[PDB]
Structure 1
Amino acid sequence: VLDGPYQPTNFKPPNDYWILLNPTNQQVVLEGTNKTDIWVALLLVEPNVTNQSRQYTLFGETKQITVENNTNKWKFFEMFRSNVSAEFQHKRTLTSDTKLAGFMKFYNSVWTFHGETPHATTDYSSTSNLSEVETVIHVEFYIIPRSQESKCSEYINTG
């Protein structure tokens, strides 16, 4: 059984747990940083979006970020930087008909799901300061132990 739902909050997720993210229509889904070498934001882009510059507030900064979604699925744009002064790069995309995404702190790395349902897979970004990574979660969420990653992947891919 999933642990949740939890309402949107700002907290320090424990190690070895998946945060399963369940947006409705929030532009910004998750902001995670340790304020030293990790800044990850997941943005949500609805279906049938023409290439356009959209405005997002990320870690209090006003950013204009080019997005497109030619599909009838939802896209999570994973935006990353490793330096406080840098611009965000569009690192990964999750293309989803479940509208579920993932975040986990494990093994000196921050993990997300990417690719296109139902073949979304995990990948990571490296950090020397995992313990200080804190998340503003803008959405309803659940917590799943890493031991149950297979169910977390089933949910992300099939709902």
Structure 2
Amino acid sequence: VLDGPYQPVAFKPPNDYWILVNSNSNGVVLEGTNNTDVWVAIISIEPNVNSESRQYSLFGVNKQITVVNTSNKWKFMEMFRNNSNAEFQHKRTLTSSTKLVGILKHGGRLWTYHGETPNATTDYSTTSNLNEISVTTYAEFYIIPRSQESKCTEYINTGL
């Protein structure tokens, strides 16, 4: 049912496969880019963090990012930009008790999860250059075909 776990690598995911990362620590879980119009990084924040500034290496650059998470769940912050000259924006949030995060390339679009477990759902960013998006994971991950997406969304929301 679940292909993995693979060790952390940089690679170019094929289309229509969910990459499901089993995050452990509170740093950058995941980052991806095609070097033309998508840079995305997913940042993990542990439970019960009052508002403060933390530093993260995004694509080899130390960046200052304001974080907060007053819940008892982990927070995964989806940072995004579409221009190599811009700064990252906190685009989306996944609030999770499972610590599992997803990214998929499908239909000209880049898909992640957001919301609150157990009712987290997918959303998208657009691109003209989907197939050049490569992904560097910083924790162990599994591969799921999009045809099995409902299982992926179960994992995301209820764990392994």
For Structure 1 versus Structure 2, the TM-score category normalised by the shorter chain is over 0.9
In structure 1, the gaps of 5 or more residues are: none
Letter in 1 for 2:96: S
Moved over 4 A (4+): none
Letter in 2 for 1:52: E
Letter in 2 for 1:78: E
| Paired position in structure 1 for 2:128 | 128
8 Å CA contact 1:26–1:139 kept in 2: the answer is no
| Paired position in structure 1 for 2:75 | 75
Q: Could you state the TM-score of these two structures normalised by the residue count of structure 1? A: 0.99
Letter in 2 for 1:130: L
SS of residue matched to 2:18: strand
| Paired position in structure 1 for 2:22 | 22
Q: What percent of counterpart residues are identical? A: 70
**Pairwise CA distance, 1:119:** 0.6
**Pairwise CA distance, 1:26:** 4.4
Distance 2:90 2:113 in 1: 14
**Pairwise CA distance, 1:128:** 0.2
| Paired position in structure 2 for 1:62 | 62
The within-5 A match list for 1:6-155 is 6-155=6-155
Corresponding pairs, count = 159
Letter in 1 for 2:121: T
SS of residue matched to 1:83: coil
In structure 2, the gaps of 5 or more residues are: none
8 Å CA contact 1:75–1:94 kept in 2: the answer is yes
Q: What CA RMSD, in Å, does the superposition of the two structures yield over aligned residues?
A: 0.6
**Pairwise CA distance, 1:62:** 1.0
